[PDB]
Amino acid sequence: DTLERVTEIFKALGDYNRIRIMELLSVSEASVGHISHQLNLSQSNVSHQLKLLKSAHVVKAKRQGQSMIYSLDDIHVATMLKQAIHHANHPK
Amino acid sequence: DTLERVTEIFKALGDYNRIRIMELLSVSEASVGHISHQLNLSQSNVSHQLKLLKSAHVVKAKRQGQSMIYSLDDIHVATMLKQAIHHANHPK
Numbered sequence: 001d002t003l004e005r006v007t008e009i010f011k012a013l014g015d016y017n018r019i020r021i022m023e024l025l026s027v028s029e030a031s032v033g034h035i036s037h038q039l040n041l042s043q044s045n046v047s048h049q050l051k052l053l054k055s056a057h058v059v060k061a062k063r064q065g066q067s068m069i070y071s072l073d074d075i076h077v078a079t080m081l082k083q084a085i086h087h088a089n090h091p092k
Numbered sequence: 093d094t095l096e097r098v099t100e101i102f103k104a105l106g107d108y109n110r111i112r113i114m115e116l117l118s119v120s121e122a123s124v125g126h127i128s129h130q131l132n133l134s135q136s137n138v139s140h141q142l143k144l145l146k147s148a149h150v151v152k153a154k155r156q157g158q159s160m161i162y163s164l165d166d167i168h169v170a171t172m173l174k175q176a177i178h179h180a181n182h183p184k
């Protein structure tokens with residue numbers, strides 16, 4: 001089950017726009033409106049992707065005022081992404 | 093391009109058997125024969141998955157005697173996987 005859950009985590013990340021969303025969130029937590037604005041994605045699209053990411057426990061949301069603010073779920077997720085980005089960058 | 097490459101990395105990991113292969117390799121570097129034996133996967137299957145993993149630079153291979161020995165590409169990959177496994181395990 002552990003490895004099946006890990007599989008689900010990686011499957012959730014296997015998408016360019018979701019990676020763009022994750023990366024933006026690694027810079028700062030954000031509302032849907034802000035994510036859409038920053039990434040030139042529609043709010044309906046962003047909401048759909050976040051639902052998917054949230055189901056896979058890679059992003060979380062908290063309520064500020066009456067708005068949901070999204071962030072990477074926790075440090076493990078942040079570390080996974082930062083290490084992956086770095087890995088993609090260095091010479092092979 | 094960086095984020096497209098990261099996308100390709102995560103897409104490569106989005107599979108249960110490939111995760112099982114990665115996890116085994118995190119324990120110890122291994123030949124195809126050994127991976128197949130340990131995971132109850134066929135050698136032809138294992139070879140196919142490794143080609144895919146290698147193309148995505150998540151595993152590497154070195155020659156010992158006249159056999160190829162596979163390992164996780166490097167520490168970033170190891171860290172990504174270990175942090176993901178841990179994330180999957182802890183309470184949500």
Ligand SMILES: [Cl-]
Binds near residue numbers: 040041042045
């Ligand atoms: Cl869009």
Ligand SMILES: [Cl-]
Binds near residue numbers: 132133134137
């Ligand atoms: Cl098989």
Ligand SMILES: [Zn+2]
Binds near residue numbers: 076178
């Ligand atoms: Zn922890």
Ligand SMILES: [Zn+2]
Binds near residue numbers: 088166167168
């Ligand atoms: Zn690396």
Ligand SMILES: [Zn+2]
Binds near residue numbers: 086
């Ligand atoms: Zn490094």
Ligand SMILES: [Zn+2]
Binds near residue numbers: 075077178179180
């Ligand atoms: Zn975690």
